[PDB]
Design a protein around this ligand. Structure first.
Ligand SMILES: [Cl-]
Ligand SMILES: [Cl-]
Ligand SMILES: [Cl-]
Ligand SMILES: [Cl-]
Ligand SMILES: [K+]
Ligand code: NA
Ligand code: NA
Ligand code: NA
Ligand code: NA
Ligand code: NA
Ligand code: NA
Lengths: 140, 140
C-alpha cells in the first residue's frame, strides 16, 4: 500500500546515502594522497580510505539493485523510474571512475571530474520522485 | 499521526543528507588547498568550495530546526530524540570546526579530526530512530 512505496523510497534513499558516503571517503583519500606527496601524511591512509570506498560503492550497487527489484505501483511514473536510473548509472559510474584515477595517481583528473553535476542530476530526479510519492500518500 | 511521522522522517533525512554533502565539500576544499600549496591547482577553488560548505551547513542547521519543531508523537522516545540531538550537535559543530581549521591553513588538524566517529555516532541514532518509526507505521 503506502508501505510498498515507503519501502521503495527507503531503498532508494539508502542508495543516495551510500553514494554520498562513497563520494566523501574518496575525497578523503584525495587529501591523504596529496599529503603523502608532501610527506606530511597522517591519520587514515590512502589504501584504507580506498578500501572503504570500494566497500561503500559495492554497498551502493547492492542498495540500488534492491530498490529496482522492489515492486512499483501502477500509478507511479515509468519515465520517472527510468530517469532515476539514468542519472544513478552516470553517478555511480563516475564514482567507480574516481577509484581508478586515484589508484593511478591522477589527482588533477580526479579532482577536475564534474562529479557534482552527475550528483545534482541524480538529486534532481530523487527529489521529484519523492514528491510524486508523497502525493500518492496525500491521496491514499 | 502517520502523516506526522513521514514528515519527521523526511525532515531528519534531509539533515543527514546535507551533513554528508557538507563533509564532502569540505574534503574537496582540502584537496584544492593542498593543491594550491603544491602549485597544481585546478578544478573548483578553495573559496568556491568553502562558500558552498558554509551555505550547506546553514541549510543543515535549518533542516534540523525544522525537524525539531515538528510535533513528536507521545509514543516516540524522548530519550531517542535527545540522543539524536546529542550526536547531531557534535557532528554539526565538528564540520563548523573544519571550516575554521581550513581557513587557518591547519591542514593536519583538519585531516586528523575524528569526523567519521561523529558521523558514525549520528548515523547509529538515525538508523535506530527510523526502524522504530517504521515499526510504528507498521502498527497503524
Ligand atoms: Cl591528473
Ligand atoms: Cl560540476
Ligand atoms: Cl595543521
Ligand atoms: Cl574517526
Ligand atoms: K567502509
Ligand atoms: Na550543484
Ligand atoms: Na527528506
Ligand atoms: Na593553501
Ligand atoms: Na566551483
Ligand atoms: Na545557506
Ligand atoms: Na547536544
Amino acid at each position: 500500500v503506502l508501505q510498498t512505496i515507503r519501502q521503495q523510497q527507503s531503498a532508494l534513499n539508502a542508495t543516495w546515502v551510500e553514494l554520498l558516503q562513497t563520494r566523501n571517503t574518496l575525497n578523503r583519500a584525495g587529501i591523504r594522497w596529496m599529503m603523502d606527496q608532501s610527506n606530511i601524511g597522517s591519520g587514515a591512509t590512502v589504501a584504507e580510505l580506498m578500501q572503504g570506498a570500494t566497500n561503500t560503492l559495492k554497498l551502493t550497487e547492492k542498495n540500488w539493485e534492491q530498490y529496482e527489484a522492489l515492486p512499483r505501483d501502477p500509478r507511479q511514473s515509468e519515465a520517472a523510474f527510468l530517469e532515476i536510473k539514468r542519472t544513478y548509472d552516470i553517478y555511480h559510474g563516475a564514482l567507480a571512475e574516481l577509484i581508478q584515477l586515484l589508484g593511478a595517481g591522477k589527482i588533477n583528473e580526479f579532482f577536475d571530474q564534474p562529479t557534482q553535476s552527475y550528483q545534482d542530476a541524480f538529486e534532481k530526479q530523487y527529489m521529484a520522485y519523492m514528491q510524486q510519492n508523497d502525493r500518492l500518500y496525500d491521496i491514499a
